[PDB]
């Protein structure tokens, strides 16, 4: 089997000539040449088999990517693993190669109006389907959009997305957190488990902003700075803001804060088109409650060229793992992997 960067790929005969593109936590992503549909495509060797949590985070990409069907969600094209449960100790998820992603073009490009345009455009557009099936993505970021060379966007990383469950979103103040630092939204902080599908909009707000100025607009190094970082855009929550905060300990925390007063989008992004930061303001809304939802970003003046729901798909159907030990959830994997054995 060929070897990549000191690691077995056990994808063969039908994916060969394999070139590394990265690695992170438990696997490695390659480009094969797919021997079936004669084209390059990318795969990501999983050995996620002796932490639970990476376990979690892998069955959850599968059982949600392989229900979804969508232009701008990544598909599962196959999945390759041993035969058995006893000789399975990685998985690789074959998927569409992609040029790049959002974070990459953002360090080097600057993004042209129309672009943007279009990229958030089909960010809200896979968002659109995704809360259509109940499900809340939560890690948006640029470096989970993917793009072609035609600028085609698909939302990837599905390893955090959850149900939504509204009902059961309140916490306590400064209550720990998974998702990436810089996108999550205020209530994070003050009071919210984020399970509710507005802190996919504030995420897709975030991206917007970064977009504008290719830099992160809430850039926070810690817990409780991203807070401040938000806080020092939006200025003070009003009262009618504040009163929703039932927990005392978040409440008084934001009381205990000098004034502070909004910083004006139009001075913060000078060049940008002013339908763009009419939408930013509305997704980044200090109240989840008032906060702007994806069909409605959608409807919003700035996406007029594009905007068109007959063409903007949704969900046949609605979508525990927690407490699941990693023996059982290795039992699941190999069980949702099986229709892609021959
Ligand atoms: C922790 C875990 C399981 N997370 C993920 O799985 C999340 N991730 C990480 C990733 C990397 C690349 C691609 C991907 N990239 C491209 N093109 C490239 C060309 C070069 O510029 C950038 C884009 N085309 C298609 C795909 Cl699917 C997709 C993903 C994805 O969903 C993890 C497992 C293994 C390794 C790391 C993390």
């Known amino acids: ?47 996620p088999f002796e932490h ?25 094209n196959d999945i390759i693993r041993a035969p058995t449960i006893e000789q399975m100790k990685d998985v690789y998820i074959v998927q569409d190669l992609m040029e790049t992603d959002l974070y990459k073009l953002l360090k080097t490009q600057h993004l042209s109006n129309d672009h943007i ?5 089909q960010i ?29 966007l698909k939302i990837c990383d599905f390893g955090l997305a959850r149900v939504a469950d509204p009902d059961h979103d309140h916490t306590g103040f400064l209550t720990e957190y998974v998702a990436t ?21 504030w995420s897709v707000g975030c991206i917007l902003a ?17 807070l401040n970082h938000i806080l020092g855009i939006l200025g003070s929550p009003s009262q009618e803001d504040l009163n929703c905060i039932i927990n005392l300990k978040a409440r008084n925390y934001l009381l205990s804060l000098p004034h502070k007063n909004k910083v004006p989008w139009n001075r913060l992004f000078p060049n940008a088109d002013s339908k763009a930061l009419d939408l930013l303001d509305k997704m980044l809304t200090f109240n989840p409650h008032k906060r702007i939802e994806v ?36 039992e699941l994997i190999f069980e949702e992997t099986a229709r892609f054995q021959p």
């Open 52 to 76: 639970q949590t990476y376990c979690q985070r892998t069955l959850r990409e599968i059982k949600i990517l392989l229900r979804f069907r969508h232009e701008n969600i990544i598909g599962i």
């Open 117 to 121: 345009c279009y990229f958030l455009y």
């Open 181 to 201: 630092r810089w996108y999550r939204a205020p209530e994070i902080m003050l009071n919210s488990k984020g399970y509710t599908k507005s802190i996919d909009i």
């Open 1 to 47: 089997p060929e070897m990549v960067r000191g690691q077995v790929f056990d994808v063969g005969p039908r994916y060969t000539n394999l070139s590394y593109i990265g690695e992170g936590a438990y696997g490695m992503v390659c480009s094969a040449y797919d021997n079936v549909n004669k084209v390059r495509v990318a795969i990501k060797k999983i050995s």
């Open 295 to 330: 069909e409605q970003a959608l409807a919003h003046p700035y996406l007029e060229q594009y905007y068109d729901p007959s063409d903007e798909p949704i969900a046949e159907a609605p979508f525990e793992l927690d407490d699941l030990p990693k023996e059982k959830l290795k």
């Open 124 to 152: 809200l557009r896979g968002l659109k389907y995704i809360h259509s099936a109940n499900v809340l993505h939560r890690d948006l970021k640029p470096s989970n959009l993917l793009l072609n060379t035609t600028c085609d």
């Open 210 to 226: 970064e977009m504008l100025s290719n830099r992160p607009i809430f850039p926070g190094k810690h817990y409780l700075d991203q």
